[PDB]
Design a protein around this nucleic acid. Sequence first.
RNA 1: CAAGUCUGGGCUAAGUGGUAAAGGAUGUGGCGCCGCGAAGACAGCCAGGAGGUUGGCUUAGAAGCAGCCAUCCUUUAAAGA
Lengths: 141, 139, 37, 274
Amino acid sequence: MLMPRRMKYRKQQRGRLKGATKGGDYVAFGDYGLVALEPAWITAQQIEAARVAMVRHFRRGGKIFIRIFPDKPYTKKPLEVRMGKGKGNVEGYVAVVKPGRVMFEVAGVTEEQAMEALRIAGHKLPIKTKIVRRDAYDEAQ
Amino acid sequence: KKVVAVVKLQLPAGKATPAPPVGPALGQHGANIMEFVKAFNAATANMGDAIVPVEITIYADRSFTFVTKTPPASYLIRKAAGLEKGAHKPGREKVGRITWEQVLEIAKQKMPDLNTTDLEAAARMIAGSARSMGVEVVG
Amino acid sequence: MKVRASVKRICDKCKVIRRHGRVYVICENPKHKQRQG
Amino acid sequence: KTKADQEKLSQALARLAEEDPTFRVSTHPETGQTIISGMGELHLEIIVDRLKREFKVDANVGKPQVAYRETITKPVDVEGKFIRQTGGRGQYGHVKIKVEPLPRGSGFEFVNAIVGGVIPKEYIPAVQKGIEEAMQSGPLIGFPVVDIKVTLYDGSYHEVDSSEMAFKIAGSMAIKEAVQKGDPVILEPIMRVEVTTPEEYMGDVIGDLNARRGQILGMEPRGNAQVIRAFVPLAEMFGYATDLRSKTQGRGSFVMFFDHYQEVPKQVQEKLIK
RNA sequence: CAAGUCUGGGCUAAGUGGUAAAGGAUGUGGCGCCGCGAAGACAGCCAGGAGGUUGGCUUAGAAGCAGCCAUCCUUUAAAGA
């Protein structure tokens, strides 16, 4: 799992997921990448579950680059409780993902293998995904 | 009164006991299973070991026949390098070796078996069997 | 592998048929005999 | 069943063993249960009718048990203390040992590793009868903890407090913990088998044997037949008669002999903790 | 149920229309780029489909065909360790 070690605020507000990405919409590291097609909230577990299966799939493989990072506390009031009384405690964390965002990317591996691993990752995620290569990701400084 | 044959056994050098696969498969041969450990180990008393392929053919009169080839291409190549085993992983690991001539000497040993009638080709089949067991060829 | 919601090709000898508005998938191993549903 | 029927059964064989010496009755000398030697399913079966009916005994019919053994992986060394100074028979015993696993089929070995004699002469036999004792009930389930070497390489004592017996405990304490500590491992019985079979049925023969936790060792043919040698676990070995004669329509025969003991695949570790 | 069963061009064959997702599919139209092209291509027929060599390691045994590597030679019109 992954998560902030410290934090100014234990809880923060919802907010809303829009288009664009702000950044990380390009390669820059490995050789192949996986990108978000719909915006969403990936939970750590969601991520983790992949990153596992990612590695799993290709015994003795390259380096796997998780380009995203959760940091939005997930709130939730307990079960069987009415409204009010303050906010809700944390549940987990999630990373606000938006389309065009390069979520993960592998480096050093046969295409046959990259095209596979990434494929499976997409299955542990909630959102539809694309695999991009490396053409014009040249200069995005 | 069994049926006929072009039996393609593969018996090593010396070990000629009626025990299978020389019993079931030469049980329809009438095969003098003992007129081998003498007529064999006579010719291969030279060599010593190394398997020696053999084709014992039966007929109806219930007699046998058999011609033998050469010892594995991989044989002469183990002793010509202080080897026994290949190199487990051919290629990356050399354990011993054979020169441009030592290979051209073994193609002589098995040239009346392969197919080509040179050495420029024949030798190649041995230099090929080099990396088959990770035994780089000296040049 | 008969009825399902994800019918695919489980080995080269398989073939994605579609008789009758229904995508069937047939092979030599009666195990791969599918059909989407 | 209840000890009541344990009697009807006695007579059962007491007359059935005269009326048919083609069996043999044996009370497993290590663990009550009695084995009923038969010569084929049907055989034991039809006895189960008569012996249960014409004798109205109604007992149990499951299967033989397996002579397991306990032991350990990593070697350990712990303190064996005992001391109880209140006022007199002080009861004072204390030793430290060297436990080290030994190859599966090593046996039992102690080590009198004491220098000048911080551990008196007269007290060792009892320190061993102690250790030797405790090896009885395994740490896991309770079976002969075997295949280890023990080393007594220290231990003090008391002038007036120690006792022959006090050490038997101390020592039976140091052992009762070395085993617990060095991660126990459930050893089990392996057999030697040789099916005599026409290489006709062979094909499945070996398969069958493979999917029985067993691992082959060879098949140097005989006559029209062919013999197969290999090891297997008694648990995954039962009722082999009507299993072999199956894959062979009767043309199949086997033998069996004991050999060694060997660890269980962990999957079989937690299996046995029942 | 008042006013075009109006006109030109295109699609859809489930009544989709006539309310649902991941995930599936030689659905059906339509664009694209890029290879082979009659010294004979695609399907196609009958053919041959080899010898070193059961490559070497490993294994009970692996011989093209568990699995690690390795993938050269060969006689050729061509046949893969």
